[PDB]
């Protein structure tokens, strides 16, 4: 189905999702902060703050609060991340 995948403190796009996060991560960084993503990870909202998301997972792991469908996802660098504000704000409502 259609995922959404925002990253970077600004950075927001929305893209169709359905073969593991690693497409969706590695290619949607790729366009959207980077590129060769595939290193990157996805985090998604938790508690305080952003927890770690990985391949097919990332979605029950992160969403695991009982959420319709998958979106809400943000792309952060492997080397070393740093993105959280995304999920934060514009997205710890319902969305």
Known sequence: C???FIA???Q???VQSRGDY???LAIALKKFSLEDASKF???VSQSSRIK???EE???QICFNSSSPERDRLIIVPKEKPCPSFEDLRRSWEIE
């Open 12 to 14: 927001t796009r929305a």
């Open 41 to 43: 990870i996805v985090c």
């Open 8 to 10: 970077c403190n600004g």
């Open 2 to 4: 259609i995922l959404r």
């Open 22 to 24: 690693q497409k969706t």
């Open 52 to 54: 770690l998301i990985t």
């Open 57 to 59: 997972e990332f979605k």
